[PDB]
């Protein structure tokens, strides 16, 4: 599933409002997790999962999904 995005750099929380609307997805995550963070933005056509990962670059957060179609966010997974 892909979408066209034109999300400027800025605070993360409004960028995610913009993202979920552009992707037309159910995105639900804790308010505190995204408060006072920033994104470099997202401009172009992307798979929704790849686009979300790009939007979240540098934030310390990653996308999460489970058995239902919904998306969430979580702190970046440890790698070791």
């Amino acid at each position: 599933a892909q979408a066209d995005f034109d999300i400027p750099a800025g605070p993360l929380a409004p960028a995610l409002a913009h993202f979920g609307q552009s992707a037309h997805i159910l995105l639900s995550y804790p308010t505190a997790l995204t408060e006072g963070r920033s994104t470099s933005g997202l401009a172009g056509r992307f798979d929704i999962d790849q686009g979300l990962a790009i939007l979240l670059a540098g934030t310390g957060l990653e996308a999460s999904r489970g058995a239902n179609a919904s998306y969430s966010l979580q702190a970046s997974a440890s790698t070791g």
Partner: protein, 213 residues
């Protein structure tokens, strides 16, 4: 002249094209009466919420949206109007609107794009900036940006037949996300999971969000 009445059911959105070519979308559980006469293109929002888009560019008559609380006079504007119990809220996305509270119509309050204001018959109640370029509902979505849970569920309940509430201990919990209106049960389930809440649903038309334990 030209003269029509419209309503939308609970959970229904409707697209109208008025005689002048102005487009109106009605949201859930809304009622609009339209009366074009020689003076003005009159819209009366009797219940609910509507979005005006693609305003006619060269009609000589002003466009007036009235509610019980006053008038919104549109200059080439694209704007949302929602009637609450005790006030009207306008949100402007393009152009400008002049707000005229029923008991204090002059001087008008000028609202430009990216501005939102609430008013009652006596005057302004609140005003702030918004970054949205259209209302989320008009694209089939709810969007929450740290919205208190009690207010989020008040909004969501407009789209449903039954009662939706939360325990008072939860009233200020902040909700963030984007939510397709196509399935409101999924919205409830997702918000409850994110906020680590229990969904009490013992009878079909009464749902209460509760603390987990």
């Amino acid at each position: 002249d030209w003269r029509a009445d419209y309503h939308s059911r609970i959970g229904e959105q409707r697209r109208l094209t008025l005689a002048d070519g102005t487009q109106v979308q009605l949201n859930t559980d809304s009622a609009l009466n339209v009366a074009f006469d020689q003076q003005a293109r009159r819209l009366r929002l009797v219940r609910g919420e509507m979005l005006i888009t693609r305003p006619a560019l060269a009609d000589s008559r002003p466009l007036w949206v009235d509610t019980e609380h006053g008038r919104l006079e549109s200059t080439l504007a694209q704007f949302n109007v929602r009637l609450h119990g005790q006030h009207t809220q306008a949100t402007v996305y393009q152009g400008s609107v002049a707000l005229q509270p029923a008991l204090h119509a002059y001087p008008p309050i000028l609202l430009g794009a990216g501005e939102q204001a609430s008013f009652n018959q006596q005057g302004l109640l609140a005003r702030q900036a918004v970054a949205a370029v259209a209302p989320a509902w008009s694209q089939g979505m709810l969007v929450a940006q740290g919205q208190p849970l009690a207010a989020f569920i008040e909004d969501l309940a407009r789209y449903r037949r039954g009662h939706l509430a939360c325990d008072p201990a939860l009233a200020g919990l902040r909700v963030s996300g984007t939510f397709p209106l196509e399935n409101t049960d999924k919205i409830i389930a997702a918000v409850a999971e994110t906020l680590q809440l229990e969904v009490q649903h013992f009878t079909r038309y009464w749902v209460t969000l509760k603390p987990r334990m």
